[PDB]
Structure 1
Amino acid sequence: PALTEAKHQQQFFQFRLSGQTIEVTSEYLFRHSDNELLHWMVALDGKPLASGEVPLDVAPQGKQLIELPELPQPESAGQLWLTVRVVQPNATAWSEAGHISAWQQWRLAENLSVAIPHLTTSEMDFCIELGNKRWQFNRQSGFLSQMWIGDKKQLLTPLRDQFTRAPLDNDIGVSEATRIDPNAWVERWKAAGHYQAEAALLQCTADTLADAVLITTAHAWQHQGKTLFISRKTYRIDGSGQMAITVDVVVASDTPHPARIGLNCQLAQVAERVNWLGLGPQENYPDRLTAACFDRWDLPLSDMYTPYVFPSENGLRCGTRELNYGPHQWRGDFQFNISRYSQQQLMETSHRHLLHAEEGTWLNIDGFHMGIGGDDSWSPSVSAEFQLSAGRYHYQLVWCQ
């Protein structure tokens, strides 16, 4: 995936948007743009609204102003996105016809958007029912432990907070089981107990509102007496079957910054494809996502796993506003990865060929995710602005059918 990032950062055309005017600057030193046309497209939440093509005629180190025709003023809600791509119409010795050599995306105008579930309480769980949908929250764990559509269970593993990732080579550095490197991210995480932290239930309560049921939970993650993380959640299940999850996390200032702040569950279903409105199509992370474009992407599940020979956290897509998998839809503003391999398996397997697809599908939905680094892979390389150091984090999801 990184290659695409390189391609984007090294591209020979730079773009600047001013109103509806695109300034295309050539970083070629010698050649005129004699085999380039600029395709542009305006889209609303992934739906195209207008497009066009303009031949590039820009001298080396020169500028070309391209005036866009009046773009649409869709009175519907959502964010307009302008995407430009430079296409080489004719083949070269090194490229086929239609080769994409450069691209850029900007946000245009945004228009902001302007039966009651029955609760049954037992000593062991809260059960919420609405039509053929059923949610089961375990009161001893404090987590959404099962979901039914009709009679079919949807979860193999409860929906739980996740603050760790299968370490990247950049997280490990030169640290080895025999020769620990204490400044490596993985060693700091392990020493702080991030991978061994035991969730402790502080609160689990249910309450029926006028048109919804509200489940409020609070957990503390602890290691050797120290509280690393506190998660306080609210689950609001309303008369439309939509489960709105609000998550507020506190992170101890003195514990190493966590790799991620999100949720994970093992979904019982395995679907052939993953659809999402977000950055894609390829794997992208907070400090490697410039090359990714915001759009409606639809890929086979296999393409959501990057087969790094040394397994690690992989396949994240950021800036995601909608995720569709099977009958499930998640909405919000999150990063996600979706695969057949748990973070645990990735972490404890040395070679990709030794991975075995687990039952169902592991979904990691993150409100926040740490950078991956890469300035070097033998010292901490994640820049401060990509570390999860804020101490308090908030994210909201909506899970529905």
Structure 2
Amino acid sequence: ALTEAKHQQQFFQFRLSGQTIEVTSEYLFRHSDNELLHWMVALDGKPLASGEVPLDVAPQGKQLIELPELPQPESAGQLWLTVRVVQPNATAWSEAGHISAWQQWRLAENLSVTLPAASHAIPHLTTSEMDFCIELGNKRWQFNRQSGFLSQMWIGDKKQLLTPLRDQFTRAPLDNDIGVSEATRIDPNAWVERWKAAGHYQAEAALLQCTADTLADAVLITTAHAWQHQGKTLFISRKTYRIDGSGQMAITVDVEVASDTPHPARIGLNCQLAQVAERVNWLGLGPQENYPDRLTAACFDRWDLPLSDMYTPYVFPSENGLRCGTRELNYGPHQWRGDFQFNISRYSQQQLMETSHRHLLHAEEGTWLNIDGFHMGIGGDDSWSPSVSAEFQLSAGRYHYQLVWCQK
């Protein structure tokens, strides 16, 4: 959280107007003499321009900066402008080259019109009575017909799932989700308290429908679950899986949330990756952990970091290391695409929920992946009463998300 702070607290404010940039100094007594403003442009992570420019802004002053005529590529993707204020020389409290601030804007968007190149190959579907199997080349996908889940997937001979791919609406309760609710003295207004008390944590799925159809070019998996607790339907999960000639899977999801139930901490899926890699690369906001009511200090970019770094050692273990507005992320041979939020560590949430201390958790067989279509804000105004803004609560009822799962 130290970052959302530094950033919000910065001394230089920015306004971009066209290719022009307005800088505002919040300094009251000092002129900017140890400032340099770098700036850069870049299609989905790829640089196309850099530029340094020395700030000469007085305290309370404004300063103008005209961006040299930008570049423009046809290439799909989003254009992003990012800036930073740099302290060329070292001071007493800062190293030389210290970043004192930054801001970033999205310049443009060239959408992708192009359609794919009509599968050379095709998915084959095996209709066991227990499963629906799908194959195409070295790749195979197992949909269990009784759980409605996607129990297992192979790349060649190797399995990839230790667990299945399933809907998730919960979260190992952060400090603020708990507040002062105790075991003796329960706080019925605690987010967790209300969640706890509604069966969020113990809802149980219910196959309502599981089908396969073969499409002129792909395999269609339809499924629908209802999660309930005491004859009470809390949620409804409606998906479709689409495996096509490129051995690419398209996940489309659509959840219904019963008005009269506390709002979910989240909405998405999770599974245990059989695998374990060293690095994590994604295209979104980062590098650091970031939540919805807490991501203004984060930058959209191509980030590359170590597994160790995607987990936040909060002495009192709780949900963490989330990264928002992710468009893509690669882990091992996997690659996921769409818009979402994710978290990837070596710990089930349960392990998180059930551990009082960080030093008591242990890494698990594979890799726990949490993909969120959506996720509730964290809160924080106080950690003794709900301090989560309504905007950051998943109150829609109706929710939709889609994924593309594939390999390399």
TM-score, with length taken from structure 1: 0.99
Q: CA deviation at 1:239?
A: 0.3
2:107 equivalent in structure 1:
108
- Once residues 74 and 50 of structure 1 are traced to their aligned partners in structure 2, the CA distance between those partners, rounded to angstroms, is 12
TM-superposition CA deviations, 1:186-241 (whole Å, max 9, x none): 00001010000000110000001011100000000000110000000000000001
Task: Please give the alpha-carbon distance, in whole angstroms, between the structure 2 residues aligned to 1:400 and 1:70.
Answer: 38
Q: Distance in 1 between matches of 2:55 and 2:229?
A: 60
In the TM superposition, what is the alpha-carbon distance from 1:29 to its structure 2 partner? 0.3
Q: C-alpha offsets along residues 64-102 of structure 1, whole Å, 9 cap, x if unaligned?
A: 010001111111000000000001000010000110000
| Residue 292 of structure 2 corresponds to residue 286 of structure 1 | yes
- Cross-structure match for 2:143: 137
Kindly provide the CA deviation profile for residues 331-363 of structure 1, in whole angstroms up to 9, marking residues without a partner as x. Answer: 000000000011010000000000000110000
**For 1:157, what is the secondary structure of its paired residue?**
coil
What SS class does the counterpart of residue 10 from structure 2 fall into?
coil
Taking only the aligned residue pairs, the percentage that are identical comes to 100
Q: 1:20 aligns to what?
A: 19
Q: Distance between the aligned counterparts of 1:241 and 1:68, measured in 2?
A: 44
State the Cα deviation string for residues 368-387 of structure 1 (Å, max 9, x = none).
Answer: 00000000000001100000
Deviation at 1:271, TM superposition (A): 0.1
Trace 1:89-128 onto structure 2 (pairs within 5 A).
Answer: 89-114=88-113, 115-128=121-134
Counterpart for residue 172 of structure 1: 178
Which residue number in structure 1 is paired with residue 62 of structure 2?
Answer: 63
Provide the secondary structure at the position in 2 that maps to 1:368.
strand
Q: 2:164, 2:3 → 1: CA distance?
A: 35
Cα deviations by residue, 1:127-161 (Å, 9 ceiling, x for unpaired):
01010000000010001111100000000000000
Give 1:178 shift: 1.1
Match of 2:370 among 342, 349, 364: 364
State how far apart, in whole Å, the 2-side matches of 1:241 and 1:70 are: 42
Runs of 4+ in 1 over 2 A off after TM superposition: none
SS for the counterpart of 1:196 is coil
Secondary structure in 2 aligned to 1:156?
coil
Task: Give, in whole Å, the separation in 2 of the partners of 1:178 and 1:267.
Answer: 38
Cα distance between partner residues in 1 of 2:60 and 2:151:
59
* Aligned-partner SS, 1:188: helix
Structure-1 separation of matches of 2:346 and 2:184: 30
Separation (CA, whole Å) in 2 of partners of 1:70 and 1:235: 44
- Quote how far apart the aligned CAs of 1:177 are: 1.1
Q: Any idea what SS the aligned residue of 1:76 has?
A: coil
Paired with 2:372 and 2:272, the residues of 1 have a C-alpha distance of 15
SS of equivalent to 2:23: strand
Deviation at 1:109, TM superposition (A): 1.4
Matched, 1:394 2:394: no
d(CA) in 1 for partners of 2:60, 2:39: 22
CA distance in 1, matches of 2:184, 2:140: 49
- Please show how residues 21-60 of structure 1 align to structure 2 within 5 Å: 21-60=20-59
CA RMSD between the two structures = 0.4
SS at match of 2:153: strand
Cα distance in 1 for residues equivalent to 2:75 and 2:216: 29
Looking at structure 2, the residues matched to 319 and 51 of structure 1 have their Cα atoms a distance apart, in angstroms, of 24
Deviation at 1:310, TM superposition (A): 0.2
SS at match of 2:4: helix
Find the aligned partners of 2:94 and 2:367 in 1 and give their Cα distance: 38
**SS at 2:5 equivalent:** helix
The CA distance in 2 between the partners of 1:56 and 1:389, in whole Å, is 44
Provide the C-alpha distance between the structure 1 equivalents of 2:317 and 2:242, rounded to a whole number of angstroms.
37
- Equivalent-residue separation in structure 1 for 2:97 and 2:217 (angstroms): 54
In structure 1, stretches of 5+ residues that fail to align are: none
Task: Determine helix, strand or coil for the equivalent of 2:59.
Answer: coil
CA distance, structure 2, for counterparts of residue 356 and residue 124 of structure 1 = 34
3-state secondary structure, aligned to 2:183: coil
Distance 1:396 1:153 in 2: 24
Which one of the candidate residues 183, 202, 207 is aligned to 2:213?
A: 207
Quote the Cα distance in structure 2 between the aligned partners of 1:65 and 1:128: 59
- State the shift of 1:47 in Å: 0.6
CA distance in 2, matches of 1:212, 1:320: 27
Which whole-Å CA distance do the structure 1 matches of 2:43 and 2:294 have between them?
24
Unmatched runs of 5 consecutive residues or more in structure 2: 114-120
Aligned-partner SS, 2:206: strand
**1:380 maps to which of 386, 392, 395:** 386
Give the deviation of 1:184 after TM superposition.
0.5
State how far apart, in whole Å, the 2-side matches of 1:48 and 1:241 are.
Answer: 31
Q: Secondary structure at the match of 1:158?
A: coil
In structure 2, distance between residues paired with 1:62 and 1:400: 51
Deviations 1:272-323 (A, max 9, x none): 0000000000000000000000000000001000000000000000010001
Deviation at 1:116?
1.0
CA distance in 2, matches of 1:72, 1:123: 57
CA distance in 2, matches of 1:347, 1:177: 14
Aligned partner of residue 353 in structure 1, secondary structure: helix
